[PDB]
Amino acid sequence: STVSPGVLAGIVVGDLVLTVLIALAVYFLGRL
Amino acid sequence: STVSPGVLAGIVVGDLVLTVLIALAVYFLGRL
Ligand SMILES: CCCCCCCC/C=C\CCCCCCCC(=O)OC[C@H](O)CO
Numbered sequence: 001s002t003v004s005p006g007v008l009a010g011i012v013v014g015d016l017v018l019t020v021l022i023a024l025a026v027y028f029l030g031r032l
Numbered sequence: 033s034t035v036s037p038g039v040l041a042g043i044v045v046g047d048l049v050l051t052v053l054i055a056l057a058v059y060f061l062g063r064l
């Protein structure tokens with residue numbers, strides 16, 4: 001087979017951190 | 033190693049849930 005536990009965690013934590021970065025950037029670009 | 037179907041489903045849903053709440057949070061905050 002499915003996915004290794006390390007690959008999944010990396011993908012997901014990566015997904016979420018990116019989600020946060022985008023959210024911050026939308027907020028601040030919205031301050032302009 | 034390999035991730036069970038149950039855990040994969042739990043993780044995928046946990047990700048989705050945190051994603052929409054992060055989006056909601058920025059919706060609210062951007063409104064201030
Ligand atoms: C292999 C591990 C990858 C780590 C990735 C972490 C990302 C999920 C973070 C928070 C979920 C919190 C929301 C709660 C939603 C239901 C609980 C849940 O996610 O359950 C997972 C568990 O594996 C059920 O078997």
Ligand SMILES: [Ca+2]
Nearest residue numbers: 015016019051
């Ligand atoms: Ca995502």
